[PDB]
Structures are given as structure tokens and as C-alpha cells.
Structure 1
Amino acid sequence: IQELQNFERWFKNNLSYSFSQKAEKVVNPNRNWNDNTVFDNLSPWTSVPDFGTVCHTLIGYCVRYNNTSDTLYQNPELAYNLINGLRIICSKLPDPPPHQQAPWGPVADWYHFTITMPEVFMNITIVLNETQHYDEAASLTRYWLGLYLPTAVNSMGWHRTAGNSMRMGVPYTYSQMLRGYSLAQIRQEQGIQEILNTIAFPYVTQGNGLHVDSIYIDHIDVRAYGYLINSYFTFAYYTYYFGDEVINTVGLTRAIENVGSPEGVVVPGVMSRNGTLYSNVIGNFITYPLAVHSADYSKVLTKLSKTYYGSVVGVTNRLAYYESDPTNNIQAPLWTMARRIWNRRGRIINYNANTVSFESGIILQSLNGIMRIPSGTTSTQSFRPTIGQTAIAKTDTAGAILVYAKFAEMNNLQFKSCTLFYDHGMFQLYYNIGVEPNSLNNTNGRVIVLSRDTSVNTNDLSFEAQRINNNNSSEGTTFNGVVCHRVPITNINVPSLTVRSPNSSVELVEQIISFQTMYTATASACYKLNVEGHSDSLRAFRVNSDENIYVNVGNGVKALFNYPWVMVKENNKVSFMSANEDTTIPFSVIMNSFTSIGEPALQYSPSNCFVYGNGFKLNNSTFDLQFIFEIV
């Protein structure tokens, strides 16, 4: 059949690429072969994790066999080892298959038999398709998957859904093609129909799924990309199998653009509960544009430039600001207060238990900086903020985010947060920082400007040595391709930069804020970060009234924070948004904003909105909440 041969060709053509997207894998294996256990130093027949390792290692060797640049490309002895490995596995599998137990090991360790093993059959059979082993591999696949994966969604007496089913459908479909069924026939099967529903990813307005502004929500109300990351590699298969209509590709691509980067750096607030800024696959999911992205409802602003990746997760009362579990409960400050740019050519330094409490933007309430929000259940618990109102405005190269938040579980911490991303830096102002009165035991708070894991050796001197070398000033302190500066604003208290080590693993540049001002919710801090080698003359101003903050980057980008409104102007384009999510904007708000940035007589025309009452109304507020005007 043409269909089968074409699929096998496509599979081999795209294997290396597909493998680069696959979350669970063993890359470039060189483990020695063993006629008893498939590979040396493993006990796969008694230990199910070891069987998983055998499975992954075999798949890894398939990729090596198939990879033109690999030293073992089309190597006949590897081909033999692969078919021999499959034979060994087949000789261990019970016939008939078990009903609702694992064939060996703990009765509940079914995973590698249902998920990973069928992928082994598929990978071995296809990569060996031009060898003398093909017909045997195909026959073993037809028989053994016929038993262990009888439908797309059933294995060993269990019905499967979600992530599990997305994995299963790929080798199942292939097994049916080997049996001579056409893709049109397979499509109509009940199991495949369930999977097609699972992979549709329609936009949703609440609950689990892809939200309307392309941020993935899991566990009812948590920003969480794990579900997408784990099964992403399967999407290309289903699109090949069943066509360009089965998956919301635009929605998913935008979802990845909204949080990821080619280097694999991802804002921690949308990642796993242990606190992480890295995925070893997300960089391979899509080709990323150089752009500023915003999710106006879910509250994410992300910029990818030629020099940096920067992102802020905002706060809305509609979504959890944090999720903890029995092990992980110190990650809330990182999820709520990370205000950082990462140099794209910098070292990817990920967090650990001793460093996860510290990052540019984090407000610390104690010297050691540990803030715990324990799970009140025997598994996970997510927490809604007491206050969560966020506005985002973006133009070509710049994006601003304005957050008003209050967190009951972090000692009633509240703040107004103003962030601006531009080429090549980031402005951050916190004002009205507050905590529960009389709660800090006479300990001053602090806002982290720069942080470093001291176990990492770079060519940067220590923060204290840099300070002393700079006439005892922490201005221009550098770490990992990022440089920090204090940003004074006349009539706003902005503390000086000082250096401190909160524990033996971390050094900080911070702005210390008095417990007295925190008690009155009047504490403030202001700094900027630059990509090393890329300085600017950014200035910020408090214009006449409280909360009216004008930032002139000095490169053509102007921004205004005037809670609840935020505005960015660049070239002939202006964007506004309200943290109240107003779908109308008054003429007077526009006029006052333009006056505040020093351009009182600006002429303008609506781009995505229309005259309605005493202002403008959005043409469409379904996905986006920014009013866009052209300066005419």
C-alpha cells in the first residue's frame, strides 16, 4: 500500500526532529548490549523502571540508526541488536495479556507497557523497514500490539484518556496500517474518535484547556504547560494521519510563542511546581518569531528579541497565583514576582531548593527569603489571589504590564507592579508594597535586583568585589550577561543598591525597604536590567499625581502607568489597556495619557476600535483587550 510506504518514509524523514520534541526519551545512547536484559546493568524483568529504561534506550538507538550523521547510521550490527532487542521483549510478554495488572513488578506499574513499549515496536519496525528484519518486526508489531493495544484507548483491561491516549493512538494507528486498514477506516473507530476530541484543543473560557488568549490552563485554574509539553510530539503524527483540521494548530503555536523560547527558557510561573525556567524540548516545538506577545485575559507578557527572552506572569482573581504539593511549597514568590530578562547567549542556570526563593523582582519578607504555602490536601492545592487586576499594552518592540495584587497566604503581601520590556532592557517599579501590619518582627523587607547561584563559576567577579571596584557602588553590577541599575524617580522613594548573601548558595543585589513603610503599604523600589553591552538612557517620572508614572526609554518607546490604565507608544502606534478589563476607553483617558507623556496635542485614529459614547469601544474583545490607535 502507498499509504503505508508514504507514512514510513515520512516517519524516517522526520524522526530526528520528532525525537527532539519528545519529552520522555534517552538521547544518543551508547549503553552496552546484553542477551539477557537487552542492555547491561539493568534488571528490566523484575524492575519496571528498568524496563522503561530498556524501552527508551531502544528508541534512542533507532534514532541513531536512522540519523545520517551518526557513526552508527544504517549499521548492520545495530540493526541486528534492535530486532534482537524486540525478540527478547516479545519472549517476556504474557499471552494472553494481563487484565488490570502489570505483566510483572507492582500491579500498578502499567505505564511502560501501555505507553513506552508500543512506541518501541513502532520505532524498530519503521527504521528497519529496508532491512531483512522488517517483515518479522511488522509481524511482531501486528501480533503483540493486537494483544496489548487492542484499540487506540484500551490496554491491559484499562480505558485510557488525555495524555496517555495521545501517546497510545500513534503506534495503534500504525499497527492498524500494518494490518492493511486505510487511514480513513482507522479514523472512524470509536477509540480514534475519542482521541480526535482530546486533541482538538478548542479555545475555552474557563477550566482546563487552551484559554481564549492561548495560555494553557490545567488543574482547573493553574497556568501549566506540562500537559502540552509531554504530548506535543504526537501532534505532528495526528496531523499527518487525519489532516490539518483535527488540531487547533494556530491556538497551540500561539500558546507556545506566548511562553517559550528557542533556547528552552520559559517563565517559571507557567511551569512545574518545583520551580523551573527550562524545558529541553519546548525550543524545538516551533520556529519562534522575534516579537512581543500578550495574553490579556490569562495575564502573560512575553518578549523574544535578538538578545533576550523576558516574561512576566500577571495576576487575575480568575486564576491561581500558585499551586503547591506535599514536597514543593516555596515557589510562590518566583511565580508571582519574577521580573527578569535572560540573555539568550547566557548560561541557562536553573533553580534548585536553595536558589528557587531568589530572582530579580522577588520581594523578600525575611533575611533567608523562604516563603512557604503548604498544600492543605494530601496532593496539590492551588490558591487564588485576594486581589488580581492586570493590564498589558504592547507595540512592535516594547510591552508594558501593570499588576495590582494581594496574596493572603504570603502575609497579605500587596503591590502595584509596573514592568516595561524594550530593546535591550527592562524597567521595573514596585510601589504601594504592603504586608499585614506588625507582622515582620522588626525585619526590613527587600526587593531583589540581581541574584546569583554562587556554585556557578562565571568570569563575573562577586557582587561585592564589583561594587568595591566601582568606587563602592553597585550600579552596573553584572551577572550572566545581564547588568543592573537603580532608576531614581523624583518624589518616589527608591533605595540604593546593596549586596547581601541570604544563604551559602546565593548572593544578591537588593533594594531594602523599611518594615514601617511596608506596614502602611507605601514601600517602593525601582530598577532596570540591560543586556550586557547594550546600554540606554531610560528615565522615569512621577507626573503630577500619585500613580502617574511616565517612562521615556529614550529610543522612541514611551510608556505610561496610570492605574488602572497602561499605555505604550512606539513610532506611530499606541496601545492602551485597563486592569479592570474595560472594553470602552474614554476620550479623556487618552487625552490625559498623551498629556502625561508630553504630547498633549497628539492626533490619532482608532485601529481596532470604534467611537462609542464618550470614547471608543473594542471591535472584538473575545481574545484581546488592548485599544490600538494610529498616530495621524
Structure 2
Amino acid sequence: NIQELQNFERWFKNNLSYSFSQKAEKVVNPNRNWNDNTVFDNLSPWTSVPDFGTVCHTLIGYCVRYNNTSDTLYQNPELAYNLINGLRIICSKLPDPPPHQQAPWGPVADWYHFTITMPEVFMNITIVLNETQHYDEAASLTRYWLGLYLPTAVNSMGWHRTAGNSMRMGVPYTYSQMLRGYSLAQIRQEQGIQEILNTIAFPYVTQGNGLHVDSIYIDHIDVRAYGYLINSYFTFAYYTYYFGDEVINTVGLTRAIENVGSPEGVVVPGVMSRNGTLYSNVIGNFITYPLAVHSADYSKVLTKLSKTYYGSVVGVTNRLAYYESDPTNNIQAPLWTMARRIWNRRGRIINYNANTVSFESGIILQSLNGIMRIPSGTTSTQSFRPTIGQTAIAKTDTAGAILVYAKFAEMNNLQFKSCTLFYDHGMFQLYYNIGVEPNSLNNTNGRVIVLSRDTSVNTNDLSFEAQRINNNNSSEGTTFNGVVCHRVPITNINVPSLTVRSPNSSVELVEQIISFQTMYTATASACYKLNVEGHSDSLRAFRVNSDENIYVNVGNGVKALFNYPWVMVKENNKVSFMSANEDTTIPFSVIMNSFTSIGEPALQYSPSNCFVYGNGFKLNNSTFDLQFIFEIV
């Protein structure tokens, strides 16, 4: 099996830099100085497990440097020596026998790094030095010590492992078996590897952990949670190599990443980690992203990636958590439920912090400071289902609309109907029927954020207040980080003017103040649009016959209709409808009424993905997507 082993090592070295660009936990281009006692200077790895983790990552980083043709220390013999010497030092400190359900040092739960990161150290060092005098020793050290610390693909130090952990473990484990002379064909049949194969298959599921039918990744039972997928994504290429293209649902996973990510690494915060983050430094390297509008009709995500912006809305369904908190992070629900923002792709990536995470375009504030706490009632995490969650999504070639009806018990019974439309090159947002529990706001007006900025970040925009005053004391056309805001009036709907306010020292806002009286009656409303800086349009919105029948004409070939429970988008020869009740038949009367509303009563249409059934049309297939698509003349 020597050629199989050598082919793999060749492949590993060829793809190392690329693979590293996908790996979430790493230290890039390390320059830390070498130390004979602690591997590197200024760390205490033998007492502090976090420092041991740093030692491990740094060694791996140095392997990447050694292997990188463009790096100054490419194939450098002294670095090769430092790497093997570093491994020798680590090996000299490892208990033998390995402990049973204890970390070699530190407390339990500091087991990570010994099980996860350390075997990766053995693998990286051994392979990158495979053409050197150090290879046999490195390989022998790996065979011995991984034989102890990773005796199977799924067991380490007396513990059985699953999910992302097992995905990490299987890669150096499989390599360790290859070093022992076993073929990939034999390794595949091992009980532990079989578990991992099940874990990485990612079949479509309708509920619980895994890849839901519409390619949104769910974890912790009911949480949109890409942080976990992101962590072990780099391992997929290894399993595909080891065991063939067929062992992973590549189509499903690719679509999952398309549905939330972007090349710049910007990701809608409602699917990201609990601290409140819109950025991953690896997700952009997972796939080649198309310019497209994506929708997940069951899990409730609408995402658009254009040449100029990334925009996304996480909707709300009673089937999934709207929020997940932990003992530290508990103020992120507004961001997860109400972010209605486009990010200029050429803009600065400003990530949230404790002082700014309560503020984003689209967030409805119930207080001046905006803090809305939902504590975890367990000793670790807790996820929360919404009281009401019904969401419809409709998309065409370049446009997509999302219509959300939600009520959140833990956010003072906050409810709303939310209407969002993404198009080239902007986003329309209308909230109506905004409500909170009557008499709960202590005579304080609510406010809907239109634009927000972290004041510590020096973009080259003047402050919102300075821009307002320069612009004849109007906040219309206020710009931040490559995005421009405008108020959108709708005759017979209350749309407050844009005003500027600094809540805390770290934040400045443009917002629409809404009366607490209308919030009490669940009749409050707000309406704005964002444009990519340098782009403008003549978007107009209209109330037609009824408060809930809202027709948007972007004026550039895109029309949308929000008529709860139905949403519709029309662009060129395509029309898409969806019901927030997730109906699999659409009545012809809904179609006729919709076409009348948008000023095209005689529109000629025929079904594209549905068929004449009962009082209208039934979806050809409702397993994955719930939009009725028609071709028009």
C-alpha cells in the first residue's frame, strides 16, 4: 500500500495551503521564536492547556510555511529540524499509558487539543517533512502516540466522540492507519470510520440536527448554527479523497454555504455564533459563489449576492428557534430576528462588539439603550421558539422578497409583519403591525433603526448628524460604509421621518421613531430603503385596497406584492408566489387578485413548476421548495 500512502502525502502537500485557508482554528504565518523547554517563547504549554493549544497551532502554521513555495522558509532545513524537535518535546511530555477520561494536565474539558489539535500536529509535521531525513522518525512517533491517543477514529483518552470532533479525529486517524500499512479500503470498514461516514453523509432531514431539506444547517436541535459546520468543513476534502466523492452530500453542503455565505466572508448574523458576528475568515474559501438570489423556503432564509452587495434575512418559523443564548451571550436576539441590511462588498467589514451588537438596520428598539436580554435558563445553552412564526419567500433572477409574521414572548411580546425586497441595487423594508405588550413601555417611544455605525471605525463618511445638517437638516441620503438610506413614504401608512440619535458612546443611528400608543395596538409602522452607494432608483410602494396589500414597483423591471399570507415577485418573464402558511396549492383567484393589484390585470401566465389542480395550481414537488413559479407574456 506504499503508492497509496505516497499519493496521499503528495496530495496533502499540494493542497495544504488551500486546506489551511478553509481551516477555522489556526495560526497563520507564525513568527514566534523557538524554545527548547516550551517549544516556543512566552508560553507555558505544560501547565496551561490553552498555551499547549497555541503551541500545537503554531507548529501547524510553521508546517504550512515550510511547505509553501512562496514562503521565505520554504524547505528550510533549520525549520525542518525545529518541527521534528518540537514534536520530540511534545512526545516527551505525554503520559503513557494515556489517561482515562482525564486531560493529561489541567481539568477535564481541557481534553480538546489533546484529542483534536495534537493529532493534527503529528500529521502535518510527518507529511510536510516526508522527503527529509526526519520522516521515518516522525512517522514512527505518529504510529506510536496516535496508537495511544487516537486508538480508533472515534475514541480518545477513554471518551467516545461524535459530530465535528469525530470529523477532525478521523483525518489523522486514517493517516495513522495508512502509516501502519492498512489500505483505505480496509480502513473504510472499521467501526469508527463507519460512524464518521454516517456523520459526514449529511442526508437531507426535515427536523433535528443536520442538513434540512432546503440546505440550511441546523444544530442544537432547532438552531440555525453554521459555526459548527464552519469549524470542521476543511475535513470534507480529506474524506472525499480517502473514501470517494460519494461519501458526502456535496450538492447539499454547497447549497448550504451558498444560502448564507459570501466570498468576502460576510454571513447573516442570525445563522452565526452566539456572540453576534457577521464574519468568518474561512467561509469565503469553502466554494466558488455564484451571483444569485437564494431561498430556503422551510428554514426561512433569503440571501442575495450581487456584484455590489451581500444581503440576507433570517425569517421566522415556529419549527425553529429564533434565538439561542448561553451564560455569557444573551443580548443577540434583536440582531438575529430583525437584521434588515445590505453590506457593500467593497465596504469595510465591521464586526459587532458588546456595545454595538444591539444595533443594525432593521432592528426595532423598545428602549434608548436597545439592550434586550434573554438569559439561558440552563447551565449552558438554551434556544427559544417564537410564539408565532410564519414566513413566505419569493425570488426571481435578481430579486427576492421575504414576508415574515412573528411574535416573540421573550422580547416583551414583540410582534410584526416584515416586508423585505432585495434587488439591484438596493433593499426595501416595511414593518407594519409592529406591536409589544400593551402598557409595557413606560411612555417611551419605540424606534426602527435605518442606519447604524460603530463610531470607533474611521470610514470616510462624516457623522450622521453632520451629514444631516449639511443636507439642509435632512437625513435622506445619509451614507455609511458604502450604503445609502432613504425613507419610503406610502400613502395611508404612517412612515416617520428619519432622525439621528446616539444611544451609547460607541454608536450613532438614523432611525424612525414610532409612537408607543400604536405599538400597544400593534399598528405601528416604518419604511425605508437602502442603496449601494453610487446607485439610485425610483422605487415606489402603494397600499392597494387593504392595509396588508402592499405593491412595490422598483421601477426597473422588478415588482413585488406583499399580501399576507402571500408574497409575489415579478421580473422579466418570471413570477414567483409563496404562502406564509406553506400551502402547496395556490388558488387562481390569488393569482388574478395579485396581477390586478400590481396593475397588470390581463397578464397572460402559465405554470412552470406546478400544475392545474383544484381551485388553482399544485406544486410539482414540495419536498425542498415551496414557491409557485409561472412564466408570463
Q: Same fold (TM over 0.5)?
A: yes
1:518 is aligned to 2:527: no
Q: Whole-Å Cα distance in 2 between the matches of residues 490 and 344 of structure 1?
A: 34
Distance 2:97 2:376 in 1: 43
Equivalent-residue separation in structure 2 for 1:312 and 1:303 (angstroms): 9
Q: Distance in 2 between matches of 1:622 and 1:64?
A: 47
CA distance in 2, matches of 1:516, 1:101: 59
The farther-off stretch of 367-376 and 22-31 is 367-376
Deviation at 1:164, TM superposition (A): 1.2
Aligned-pair distance for 1:310? 0.2
Deviates most, 502-511 or 139-148: 139-148
SS in 2 for 1:455: coil
- Cα deviation digits, residues 413-442 of structure 1 (max 9, x gap): 111100000000000000111111111111
Note the alpha carbon deviations across 1:35-81, whole angstroms, 9 max, x for none.
11110011111211111111100000000011111111111111111
Deviations 1:469-526 (A, max 9, x none): 0001000000000000000111111000000011111100000001111111111100
Alpha-carbon distance, 1:99 to partner: 2.2
Q: Which residue of 1 aligns with 2:457?
A: 456
User: Any residues of structure 2 matched to 1:51-62 within 5 Å, and which?
Assistant: 51-62=52-63
**Which stretch shows the higher mean deviation, 148-157 or 121-130?**
148-157
Aligned partners of 1:148, 1:507: CA distance in 2, in Å?
52
Shift of 1:108: 4.2
Helix, strand or coil for the counterpart of 2:594?
helix
Q: CA deviation at 1:326?
A: 1.5
Residues 423-572 of structure 1 aligned to structure 2 (within 5 Å): 423-572=424-573
Cα distance between partner residues in 1 of 2:109 and 2:437: 47
Deviations 1:504-559 (A, max 9, x none): 11100000001111111111100000000111111111112221111111111110
Q: Which is worse superposed, 539-548 or 588-597?
A: 539-548
Task: Give, in angstroms, the shift of residue 289 of structure 1.
Answer: 0.6
Quick one: structure 1 residues 107 and 608, their matched pair in 2 at CA, closer, same or farther if it must change by over 3 Å?
Answer: closer
**Alpha-carbon displacement from aligned partner over 1:78-113 (angstroms, at most 9, x marks no partner):** 111111111111122222222222222334422111
| SS of the residue 2:45 aligns to | coil
CA distance in 2, matches of 1:208, 1:136: 42
Deviations 1:375-415 (Å, cap 9, x if unpaired)? Answer: 22222111111111100000000000000111111111111
Structure 1 residues 596 and 349: CA distance shift in structure 2, 3 A: same
Separation of aligned partners in 2, 1:323 and 1:95: 41
Work out the CA distance in 2 between the residues paired with 1:110 and 1:448.
44
Match of 2:583 in 1: 582
Worse overlay, 12-21 or 99-108? 99-108
Give the fraction of aligned pairs with identical amino acids, expressed as a percent: 100
Residue 593 of structure 1 and its aligned partner are, at CA, apart by 0.5
For 1:163 and 1:544, the matched residues in 2 are separated by 53
State the Cα deviation string for residues 212-231 of structure 1 (Å, max 9, x = none): 00111111111111221111
What's the C-alpha RMSD, in Å, of the aligned pairs? 0.9
The answer for the alignment partner of 1:307 in structure 2 is: 308
Tell me, in whole angstroms, the C-alpha distance in 1 between the residues paired with 2:110 and 2:585: 55
What do residues 344-398 of structure 1 show as CA deviations (whole Å, max 9, x unaligned)? 0111111111111000000001111111111222221111111111000000000
For the residues of structure 1 that align with 2:504 and 2:465, how far apart are their CA atoms? 15
SS in 1 for 2:109: coil
Tell which deviates more after alignment, 380-389 or 421-430: 380-389
Shifted more, 502-511 versus 535-544: the winner is: 535-544
Q: CA, structure 1 residues 503+306, in 2 after alignment: closer, same or farther (shift >3 Å)?
A: same
Specify the SS of the correspondent of 1:210.
strand
Alignment deviations for residues 111-132 of structure 1 (CA, whole Å, 9 cap, x no partner): 1111111100100011111111
Query: Secondary structure of the residue that 1:403 maps to in structure 2?
Result: strand
For 1:626, the equivalent position in structure 2 comes to 627
In structure 2, C-alpha distance between the alignment counterparts of 1:424 and 1:411, rounded to whole Å: 35
Superposed CA offset, 1:445-483 (max 9, x none): 000000001111111000010001000100000000000
Quote the Cα distance in structure 2 between the aligned partners of 1:383 and 1:164.
26
Task: Specify the alignment match of 1:144 in structure 2.
Answer: 145
Task: Name the residue aligned to 1:270.
Answer: 271
Distance, in Å, in 2 between the alignment partners of 1:545 and 1:552 is: 17
Aligned mates of 1:381, 1:156 — CA distance in 2: 29
Gaps of 5+ in 2: none
Which residue is equivalent to 1:224?
Answer: 225
Distance 2:212 2:251 in 1: 13
CA–CA distance in structure 1, aligned partners of residues 6 and 18 of structure 2 = 19
Q: Which residue does the alignment assign to 1:21?
A: 22
Deviates more, 1:459-468 or 1:374-383: 374-383
SS at match of 1:235: helix
Structure 1 residues 240-249 or 87-96, which shifts more?
87-96
CA distance in 1, matches of 2:547, 2:109: 60
**Corresponding residue number in structure 2 for 1:39:** 40
CA deviation after TM superposition for structure 1 residue 151, in Å: 1.0
Spell out, residue by residue over 1:319-348, the C-alpha distance to the aligned partner (whole angstroms, 9 max, x if none).
Answer: 111111111111111100000000001111
Which residue of 1 is the match for residue 183 of structure 2?
182
Q: How many residues align?
A: 632
Distance across 2 between alignment mates of 1:187 and 1:573: 47
Q: Distance in 2 between matches of 1:301 and 1:582?
A: 19
Range 167-176 or range 96-105, more displaced: 96-105
Per the alignment, in what secondary structure is the counterpart of residue 4 of structure 2?
helix
Q: TM-score, normalised by structure 2?
A: 0.99
Aligned to 1:213: 214
CA distance in 2, matches of 1:164, 1:576: 41
Distance in 2 (CA, whole Å) between partners of 1:309 and 1:17 is 24
Deviations 1:238-282 (CA, angstroms, capped at 9, x unpaired) = 010001111111111101100011111110111111111111111
Q: Following the alignment from structure 1 to structure 2, what is the Cα–Cα distance between the partners of residues 462 and 197?
A: 53
Distance in 2 separating the partners of 1:67 and 1:380: 41
Q: Which runs of 5+ in 1 are unaligned?
A: none
Alpha-carbon distance in 2 for matches of 1:327, 1:525: 32
Q: Secondary structure at the match of 2:289?
A: coil
The superposition leaves residues 153-189 of structure 1 with CA deviations (integer Å, 9 ceiling, x where unpaired) of: 1112222111111111000100111111110000001
Distance 1:388 1:48 in 2: 43
Deviation at 1:142, TM superposition (A): 1.0
Look up the SS of the partner of 1:432 in the other structure.
strand
The 5 Å alignment of 1:602-621 reads 602-621=603-622
Q: Tell me the SS of whatever aligns to 2:541.
A: strand
- Residue of structure 2 equivalent to 1:131: 132
| Residue 323 of structure 1: aligned partner | 324
Residue of structure 1 in register with 2:385 after alignment: 384
Q: Give me the whole-angstrom Cα distance separating, in 1, the residues matched to 2:101 and 2:414.
A: 49
The CA distance in 1 between the partners of 2:108 and 2:259, in whole Å, is 41
Distance in structure 1 (CA, Å) of the matches to 2:76 and 2:473: 63
Matches of 2:535 and 2:228, distance apart in 1: 37
Structure 2 distance, partners of 1:388, 1:509, is: 28
**In the aligned structure 2, how far is the partner of 1:525 from the partner of 1:106?**
52
| TM-score normalised by the chain length of structure 1 | 0.99
Q: Describe the SS at the equivalent of 1:114.
A: coil
- Alignment match, 2:91: 90
Q: Could you give the per-residue CA deviations for residues 6-49 of structure 1, whole angstroms, max 9, x where no partner exists? A: 10111011001101111111111000001111100111112111
